[PDB]
Structures are given as structure tokens and as C-alpha cells.
Design a binder for this molecule. Structure first.
Ligand SMILES: OC[C@H]1O[C@H](O[C@H]2[C@H](O)[C@@H](O)[C@@H](O)O[C@@H]2CO)[C@H](O)[C@@H](O)[C@@H]1O
Ligand SMILES: CC(/C=C/C(=O)NO)=C\[C@@H](C)C(=O)c1ccc(N(C)C)cc1
Ligand SMILES: [K+]
Ligand SMILES: [K+]
Ligand SMILES: [Zn+2]
Length: 723
């Protein structure tokens, strides 16, 4: 930490060549330089940098660096004017933010039309030729064009062709409120891309690895990639040329030009050493050549070595595309921009969403991603007719919303309008028999309802009970549709009655329709395949209904922490035991952390999060996160006997946001202390809105730690993150 020097750089670059520079630096001064390449490190770095941890030196394109600087995660760079002249002036401007410098420039990288020179000696200079050109090749069992579709960076040069742009630039300023994502040029651009996939030319499944292996095996005429790719293309038995990007509507393609940059972490005590390595060991003709021999950097920022590299007709072709395109903005809103376009492209190019709809949703979130709120006051109609002392009261959801408005959190959200669940939605998790039974209760009276209520375990029914349960589930499904279509990033569904106890053909524990489960299955239908879903049930009671509903499903990872009391705590079974790991092909996808005894608190739940939940969750890698967010495990709750603070819930929430690219949906379950649940829900909503987690306090209970490790033992043979 003070005697070392660790550096991060993306896996597509030449990290091995950088290690060699770290070896010729370790030998010179004695300091060991370790270079690792984490996945999704542009997301990983701002996580650790905030909480003091992280690498000494960060490597990435300049577009992300302004976000890091706005959070004060980067150290200010102070090079003398002598070294300043050593690079091109336009590269320094890319890493200049709010006056200060915040990174060392390394190389300029722009996309190019790499193409096979054998199967296709003449590269089409227009995008419009490609479908016809694919016809002539698809007969010979060969494709025409394949490139990465899972990242918006690769399809952007086509979107920007006819007039699409991110944020408008005038003078020195970027107008956050001026976005050209849903304008004609951008729409015409993506429309043409989707049509390629519409007509069986390109496949939507195509990613970086698939597309590279296709071109390298000589079964794809053209591809789109950066200088870094060239190295792998050489070893390949493929003769390749690099030229200008094809035109769209007679317009030159405009790729988003990026600059490979190196920043110093603010928490690094090794700053001076950081300055020494980057300036006098990396940014030299010798150092830059070491990396470039591994993977081509492109057009480097260093004047001396650039003159040598500029003889390359490929680098010249890289400069041609870069000049026709535009240099990426460094403003801290780029992260929200790239996520919007990523969602829009994936959605539209699949068939789920349309060009008009997808771009319209992205247009609204280029500046910042929104958080959705969904709630209906009519859900208060469901009430107990013979017992006013029952804890599941209509005041539960009102007190929450009323508190969200007091703190002004509700206004900072994008309030979604709910709707009843369609018959199809409910039939995915509940039988038509049980649904009909429950709808029949609508026209019963208090006497008939009493006998009807005694048919189930811990249930009260009133004439409104069907409309409310139908609304709670339908509301959560609306939230699903919102997140999965780029309307929001994450959201909260303040609803009642609860649902995680509801079985397929039976009501139980104040539940009728399992809203979380229906939402899970619903999410998989609108995507059209078995989407990977994570369900975290941090309610103080075990969600027996949810577990049984996905007991054999390996596409839905269900995690639950709850009072067990040796099978005595409600719902009273052994179904919530730690040894219950699901069955069949879903074995290992049912995780039960079972508490023995009361007073489980913050330190207890945080222990489980770091030792079990997060490792398993990350290995599972969900594409959507649903939370049975009951707050009866909270402090001051009359039923749960636990002491989790609102500050604690905020941390648990904020920690789960690193999953599924931040796609989370908190759906309310239990919680019966009006002040405790409204406070906890507010603290959670704060975390969802990007607000920083508060400070905390109180060692882990021993019996809790016993409980935790007890269930990792049973799961250690099904999860490598537990080994
Ligand atoms: O796809 C969005 C992505 O675009 C850019 O990332 C590039 C990067 O610049 C290249 O060096 C290489 O790693 O390909 C990446 C895309 O796969 C932006 O730099 C990045 O912020 C953004 O997420
Ligand atoms: C069903 C349940 C938990 C539900 C939940 O929160 N699921 O998530 C708790 C039951 C066992 C309970 O303890 C109880 C206590 C008092 C009471 N009245 C004073 C009316 C009614 C019920
Ligand atoms: K639970
Ligand atoms: K499961
Ligand atoms: Zn509960």
C-alpha cells in the first residue's frame, strides 16, 4: 500500500507489455509493480476509490475521467511545462477538467473498417451496399460484416452519421440539456442497423469475442475494431486491410474518439512514485513501444514516437476516421449517456423495443438516469374488518409515501402510474382456480369472508382484497417494464398486501399474490428468454412462497435471510432451513441464511453480505435484481425482534447496486412499525438516487456468524466464490 505500486488497465489492451515496463522499473528502483485487469473496471474503480481502497493508477479512455474528478477520486496532476510540450496539446485538453489536469494522456484510439483482403479485395465505401454484398457472400457460406453489438461504442459511428450526437458543443461548454439521441440522424442510423439484423444478415447475439473469432477464422469479410485488435489479427491466418468507415446517406461515419489515459488515485500514498513511473518510464519512446509491441496503442500522444508510428497506413487510417469523428466529452454525465445508448441499442436490435421508443427513452436519460416510484392510494382499501389491532394496516404505505415527500425524495423520483395485473401475469405463478376463488370474495360480506379467511394460515379478507392484491402485483410489473426498457435505472414499489408468502394455490402470511415472483417471471417474458434474476429476501420472515415457486429454476437465484428459531418462527416450517438448497437443476440456487435468536443487527447483516450474498450474487451475475424489501427486521419492529438501522438498510441497498449494471427493484413486503418502515424506506430510496451511504456503528453476533458460515458450507460445492 505504501511500499508497492498497483495499476489497472482494461483486458483488451496490452497489459503484458505494461508489465514489462513495470519490470524494467522494479529493477531500477526496487518497487514491485503489479498490473491486473479486472472485469468492468470502469465500474469497479469508482466503487473502491470512494471507500479508500483501489489501485494506484487507473487506465481508461478519457470519457469517464470527469466523473472520477467530480467525485474527487483522482489526484491533481502537476507536470512541468517541459514535459507538457512532450505531448500534443489536444491530448492534454481531453484530460483537462475544471481547470486542473486529472490524467496523463497516452494514445488516441478510433474505430476503423478492418477487412479481409482476400474474400473482399474491394471494401464498400457505403453502409447501404452491405446487405446486397452479404447476399453474394452468404451463398459461399461466409458472412459480410460482424462486430460487437453489446457495446454502444461500436454502433455509434453509424448513429452519428446522418446527424446523431450526444451533448451539443458550443464555445467551450457542453449543454447538458441539449441531447441529440432521438433526433432524425440518430433514428435513421439505428433504424438501418436493426434492419440488418431484421434480415438475417447480422445476429444480435454477436459480441466482441464472437465477432473477433469470426474475422480471425476468415469467415467474415469486414469487422469494426480499434488498433488493439490488430495484434490478434496478425497471428491469425488472415490478410487484412484497414481503411475508412463506410458512409451512411452519403455521410462519413463519425466514431467517438477516445484517449487512453492514466490517472492517480487520490487515496494513493504513492503519488510521487506514480508520477515517476508514468512520466519517466511509460511516456517515453521506450516505454510506449513496449506496450505497443503487445497491443497497438494507435496514435500515441508522445510527439517523438508518434512520428515513427505515423508511417503506418493503418494508423493513418485510424487518423482518418478520428478526424471525421468527434472527440468524446469528459463531462461526468458520460456514464449515464453510455448506459442509455447501451440499453436502447440492445432493446431495439432485439425486437423488444422499437427505434422510436428506445431512442425516446434514452433521450430522456442521457444527462442522468432516473429512479422510478410506483404507488397507489387505493391499495389502502384492503383492511381487517374484525381486528383493528392487526399490524398489516393501510397506514403502512401512506406513512412511507408521506415521509418520502417530507424529505423531498419523492419529487426527485420519476413517479410511475400503476395498473392492475393482467390475467396472464397472475396465471404465470398462480392457478386459475385460486385466482377465481379470490376474485369471488369481492362480493362476499363480513360473515362469509370470516369463514373464508379461516381457510388459510394467518389471513384476513375484505371486499377490497382482490383489487388491492391485483394492484400490488401489477404495480411491480409496471416497474419491471420501466427498468427493462430504459425508462428508469432502478425503482421502488410501495405496495400492499405483501406477497412473498403466497403459494400457487393458497394464501398465507398476509399474502395473496406473490408480486415479486410474478414480476420475476414477467421480466423473462418481455425479454423473451430465461433472464437471470436475483431475488434478495431480507424480510424477517422466510419467503416460503417465493422459494417453492423457483425451487427448480436455475435462472432465478433466490436468497433469503430470516428468523428460524429451529423451525419455530413463522412460517413455522423446516422449509427455511439452511440445508434447503432447492432441487433438480436448481440445486444451489436456493440460499437460506437462518437466524437462531433475536437482536440480529447491522453488523450481522453486513457480515452475511460480504461473506455470502455478494460473492454468490456476483458469480451468478444477474441481469436484474428484485428485492423482497420487507422492513420487519428493522429496529423497533414489534414482530421481528431485530435491530437493523435505516443506515444499515441504505448500505445493504447501495451494495447491491453493483449488480446487474444497477438494475434493482425494491418491492415492499413486511414491516409493521410505521416510523421504522418509513425511515428505512427513505434511507433506501436515498441510496437508489445515487446519494452516498451514511456512516455506521457493535460487533457481529456469534450465533449469527455460526448461522452464516453454516449455509456457505452447504453451498461451497456449488459456488466457486465460496471456496
Ligand atoms: O461501449 C461504451 C464504452 O465506450 C468506450 O469504451 C471503449 C474503449 O474506449 C475502448 O478502448 C475499448 O475498451 O472498447 C470500449 C468499448 O467496449 C468508452 O470509453 C466507455 O466509457 C463506454 O462505456
Ligand atoms: C404472519 C406474520 C408475518 C407476516 C410477515 O411479515 N411476512 O413477511 C406474523 C404473525 C405470525 C404474527 O406474529 C402476528 C402477531 C400479531 C398479530 N396480531 C396482533 C393481529 C398477528 C400476527
Ligand atoms: K427473508
Ligand atoms: K432457485
Ligand atoms: Zn415479514
Amino acid at each position: 500500500e505504501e511500499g508497492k505500486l498497483v495499476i489497472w488497465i482494461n483486458g483488451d489492451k496490452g497489459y503484458n507489455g505494461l508489465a514489462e515496463v513495470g519490470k524494467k522499473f522494479e529493477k531500477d528502483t526496487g518497487i514491485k509493480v503489479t498490473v491486473e485487469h479486472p472485469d468492468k473496471l470502469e465500474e469497479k474503480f469508482p466503487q473502491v476509490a470512494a471507500t479508500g481502497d483501489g489501485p494506484d493508477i487507473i487506465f481508461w479512455a478519457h470519457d469517464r475521467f470527469g466523473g472520477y474528478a467530480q467525485s474527487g477520486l483522482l489526484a491533481e496532476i502537476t507536470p512541468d511545462k517541459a514535459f507538457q510540450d512532450k505531448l500534443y496539446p489536444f491530448t492534454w485538453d481531453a484530460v483537462r477538467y475544471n481547470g486542473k489536469l486529472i490524467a496523463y494522456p497516452i494514445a488516441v484510439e478510433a474505430l476503423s473498417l478492418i477487412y479481409n483482403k482476400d474474400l473482399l479485395p474491394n471494401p464498400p465505401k457505403t453502409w447501404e451496399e452491405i446487405p446486397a454484398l452479404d447476399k453474394e457472400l452468404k451463398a459461399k457460406g461466409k458472412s459480410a460484416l460482424m462486430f460487437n453489438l453489446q457495446e454502444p461504442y461500436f454502433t455509434w459511428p453509424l448513429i452519428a452519421a446522418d446527424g446523431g450526437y450526444a451533448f451539443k458543443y458550443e464555445n467551450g461548454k457542453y449543454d447538458i440539456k441539449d441531447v441529440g439521441v432521438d433526433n432524425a440522424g440518430a433514428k435513421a442510423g439505428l433504424t438501418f442497423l436493426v434492419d440488418l439484423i431484421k434480415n438475417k444478415h447480422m445476429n444480435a447475439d454477436t459480441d466482441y469475442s464472437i465477432a473477433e473469432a469470426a474475422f480471425n477464422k476468415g469467415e467474415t469479410a469486414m469487422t469494426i475494431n480499434g488498433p488493439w485488435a490488430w495484434s490478434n489479427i496478425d497471428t491469425s491466418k488472415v490478410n487484412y486491410g484497414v481503411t475508412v468507415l463506410p458512409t451512411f446517406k452519403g455521410q462519413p461515419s463519425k466514431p467517438f474518439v477516445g484517449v487512453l489515459s492514466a490517472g492517480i488515485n487520490a487515496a494513493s500514498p504513492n503519488k510521487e512514485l506514480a508520477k515517476e513511473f508514468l512520466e519517466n518510464y511509460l511516456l517515453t519512446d521506450e516505454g510506449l513501444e513496449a506496450v505497443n509491441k503487445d497491443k497497438p496503442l494507435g496514435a500515441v500522444a508522445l510527439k517523438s514516437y508518434e512520428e515513427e508510428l505515423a508511417k503506418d497506413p493503418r494508423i493513418a487510417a485510424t487518423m482518418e476516421n478520428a478526424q471525421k469523428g468527434e472527440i468524446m466529452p469528459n463531462i461526468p454525465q458520460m456514464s449515464a449517456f453510455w448506459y442509455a445508448v447501451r440499453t436502447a441499442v440492445i432493446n431495439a436490435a432485439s425486437g423488444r423495443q422499437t427505434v422510436d421508443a428506445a431512442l425516446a427513452a434514452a433521450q430522456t436519460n442521457a444527462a442522468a438516469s432516473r429512479t422510478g416510484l410506483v404507488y397507489d392510494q387505493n391499495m389502502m382499501n384492503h383492511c381487517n374488518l374484525w381486528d383493528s389491532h392487526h399490524p398489516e394496516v393501510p397506514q403502512r404505505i401512506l406513512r412511507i409515501m408521506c415521509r418520502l415527500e417530507e424529505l423531498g425524495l419523492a419529487g426527485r423520483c420519476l413517479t410511475l402510474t400503476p395498473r392492475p395485473a393482467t390475467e396472464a401475469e397472475l396465471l404465470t405463478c398462480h392457478s386459475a382456480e385460486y385466482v377465481g376463488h379470490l376474485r369471488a370474495t369481492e362480493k362476499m360480506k363480513t360473515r362469509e369472508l370470516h369463514r373464508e379467511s379461516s381457510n388459510f394460515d394467518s389471513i384476513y379478507i375484505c371486499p377490497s382484497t382482490f383489487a388491492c392484491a391485483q394492484l400490488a402485483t401489477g404495480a411491480a410489473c409496471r416497474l419491471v417494464e420501466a427498468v427493462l426498457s430504459g425508462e428508469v435505472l432502478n425503482g421502488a414499489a410501495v405496495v400492499r398486501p405483501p406477497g412473498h408468502h403466497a403459494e400457487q394455490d393458497a394464501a398465507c402470511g398476509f399474502c395473496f399474490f406473490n408480486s415479486v415472483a410474478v414480476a420475476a417471471r414477467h421480466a423473462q417474458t418481455i425479454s423473451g428468454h430465461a433472464l437471470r434474476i436475483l431475488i434478495v429476501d431480507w424480510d424477517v420472515h422466510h419467503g416460503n412462497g417465493t422459494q417453492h415457486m423457483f425451487e427448480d429454476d436455475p435462472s432465478v437465484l433466490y436468497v433469503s435471510l430470516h428468523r428460524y428459531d429451529h423451525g419455530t418462527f413463522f412460517p413455522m416450517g423446516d422449509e427455511g432451513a439452511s440445508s434447503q438448497i432447492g432441487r433438480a437443476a436448481g440445486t444451489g440456487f436456493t440460499v437460506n441464511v437462518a437466524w437462531n435468536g433475536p437482536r440480529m443487527g447491522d453488523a450481522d447483516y453486513l457480515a452475511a453480505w460480504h461473506r455470502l450474498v455478494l460473492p454468490i450474487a456476483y458469480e451468478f451475475n444477474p441481469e436484474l435484481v428484485l428485492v423482497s424489501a420487507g422492513f420487519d427486521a428493522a429496529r423497533g419492529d414489534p414482530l421481528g425482534g431485530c435491530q437493523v438501522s435505516p443506515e444499515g438498510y441504505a448500505h445493504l441497498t447501495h451494495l447491491l447496486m453493483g449488480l446487474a449494471s444497477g438494475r434493482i427493484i425494491l418491492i415492499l413486503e413486511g414491516g409493521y412499525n410505521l416510523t421504522s418502515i418509513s425511515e428505512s424506506m427513505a434511507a433506501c430510496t436515498r441510496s437508489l438516487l445515487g446519494d452516498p451511504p451514511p456512516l455506521l456503528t457493535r460487533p457481529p453476533l456469534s450465533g449469527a456468524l455460526a448461522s452464516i458460515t453454516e449455509t456457505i458450507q452447504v453451498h461451497r460445492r456449488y459456488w466457486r466464490s465460496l471456496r
